Design a protein around this ligand. Structure first.
Ligand SMILES: *CC(=O)[C@H](CCCNC(N)=O)NC(=O)[C@H](Cc1ccccc1)NC(=O)[C@@H](Cc1ccccc1)NC(=O)CCOCC#C
Ligand SMILES: *CC(=O)[C@H](CCCNC(N)=O)NC(=O)[C@H](Cc1ccccc1)NC(=O)[C@@H](Cc1ccccc1)NC(=O)CCOCC#C
Lengths: 305, 305
């Protein structure tokens, strides 16, 4: 019983965090086997970001220009290259704490845990959703670049995010570990701002199920609706349209609660139309959309096994 | 920028989690040096919980009745004793991973991180506050007993909580690491009820400051109030009274924003009387009270350093 915004245990990623310094510029790197990965704008100064020529700035530095430091031991760089917006430093020692890992690209609507770091030292861990507009509402301070997002499944860490930037609204942007940004953002000092966002409908439904498993049932009605009927109200409240694939994904929770998906959509329809009657759902006065159907199962389906 | 419920990194506590089995009863233990700490009702069956005499139950147990598993490695028990409501199992081998640590008893109003575990295996990490009525609002499924709560400062882990039970209301109760329960609860299957919970007034104020730093200001006003007059309004809505100690603790935040504590108080008494009316603060449509002033300072106060 109980449902909280829960991050994955962070031990496996902590032992991979290092500090990268190139000149007066420092940030965080991820040390996996004999390579350190980090945002390429560590090779820049403040003035370089007016118009950075990364191909050129890279050729001009050599291995000795990079100081990598894991805890206090200096790691010796013996190679450097660039893949998209990520820098890769080969080092002479392989990380003995390297977990089983994969590089994945997450989709909008999906969640991950962020391990926020400064000067190579983890400071906090929390859970984020990739917004429909390819930003994340993180908590980051100066020097957090290179902090990573991940999921764990079995004993395998899937790295999906590396932190590069804060945009004007104070939301955050970054890349996958291949160095491709999520969203239409770039590592240069030029005008950028997050586009229009929408509410993640399948996640709002998963969260209402979590409530029910935990005994919150006031919002339930006896009503039901059609997928088409539901998607007309969804549009009126900036909710993205519900697909049959999303209905399938909700299978496990509908099974556990005995409430069919289109039944829970009728409940959600009434909440959007008539409000939350000054009541709370799992401790929130707002409809929450940063929990995936899998995030509910992980924390809630244990009673069913 | 940004503001997010943020746990401490869990790696140092992960390395201390074990599984403790007595007969057909299993739960989690904490392995520091050559002692495993766990809830004493691991030595009970469900039938013993109706009316347990823990001192007698423990006499009938030999060292071999305790099966401690650290991953897949069995640790042989060399001794068993009881301290208040925790069992201490002496084992033949010191945990090589034991961090610098301390046992502390925390105050109601304060926060800590919970590493939720099952069968000695960490599952997730989230942030909690000890409520005024000495309960915590967690996520604790079957087999979660013995999970711990902690804070980390420097390289030192301060353990403050061990989970023992869920109350019939769905909230959670346990002990410090000397085995003394927080609150008037007991490890026996009887009727016990948490007192009426109140809102943690100093925390709500600290959060309002974080909202201002973050750019939310629709709720600020030019009117002021007195600590006595604020507290009369506060009594009528189950808000705990605000003291001069609390005003001081909010000093660093008040300075950052240059907004006096008593002006924020006037804002709060305004939100308390009428309400918000469709508007939000840091993404929430409720007044949040699970962030301490320090919590806020450590995510938001980097700007001034
Ligand atoms: C994230 C991090 O730790 C590093 C610091 C660089 C190294 N510094 C030192 N002292 O060693 N990165 C940053 O601080 C980023 C770098 C950057 C610059 C340009 C594009 C992309 C990334 N700076 C920001 O994220 C900054 C980005 C930005 C600049 C101009 C216009 C739009 C975005 N965001 C902020 O500075 C917070 C203010 O928001 C921007 C506005 C308005
Ligand atoms: C927390 C945990 O993992 C272990 C399970 C031990 C058994 N493991 C085996 N066989 O492998 N501990 C528990 O579940 C606790 C034990 C307990 C019992 C009595 C007092 C204190 C602790 N059980 C609970 O926390 C339970 C206690 C309780 C029972 C009846 C009335 C009031 C409290 N709470 C709940 O089960 C949640 C709902 O219970 C009330 C209802 C309905």
């Amino acid at each position: 019983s109980g449902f909280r915004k829960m991050a994955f245990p962070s031990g496996k990623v902590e032992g991979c965090m290092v500090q990268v310094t190139c000149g007066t510029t420092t940030l965080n790197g991820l040390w996996l086997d004999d390579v350190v990965y980090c945002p390429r704008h560590v090779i820049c100064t403040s003035e370089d970001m007016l118009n950075p020529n990364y191909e050129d700035l890279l050729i001009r530095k050599s291995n000795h220009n990079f100081l990598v430091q894991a805890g206090n031991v200096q790691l010796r760089v013996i190679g450097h290259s660039m893949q998209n917006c990520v820098l890769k430093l080969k080092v002479d020692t392989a990380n003995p704490k390297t977990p089983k890992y994969k590089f994945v690209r997450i989709q909008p609507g999906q969640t991950f845990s962020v391990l926020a770091c400064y000067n190579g030292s983890p400071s906090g861990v929390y859970q984020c959703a990739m917004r429909p507009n390819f930003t994340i509402k993180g908590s980051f301070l100066n020097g957090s670049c290179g902090s990573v997002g991940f999921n764990i499944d079995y004993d395998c860490v899937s790295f999906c995010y590396m932190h590069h930037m804060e945009l004007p609204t104070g939301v955050h942007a970054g890349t996958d570990l291949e160095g491709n940004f999520y969203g239409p953002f770039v590592d240069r000092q030029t005008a950028q701002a997050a586009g229009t966002d929408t509410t993640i409908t399948v996640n709002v439904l998963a969260w209402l199920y979590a409530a029910v498993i935990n005994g919150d049932r006031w919002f339930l009605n006896r009503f039901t609706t059609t997928l088409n009927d539901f998607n007309l109200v969804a549009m009126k409240y900036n909710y993205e349209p519900l697909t049959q694939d999303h209905v399938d994904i909700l299978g496990p929770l509908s099974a556990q609660t005995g409430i069919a998906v289109l039944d829970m959509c009728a409940s959600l329809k009434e909440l959007l139309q008539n409000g939350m009657n000054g009541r709370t759902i799992l401790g929130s006065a707002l409809l929450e959309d940063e929990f995936t159907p899998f995030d509910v199962v992980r924390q809630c389906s244990g009673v069913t096994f």
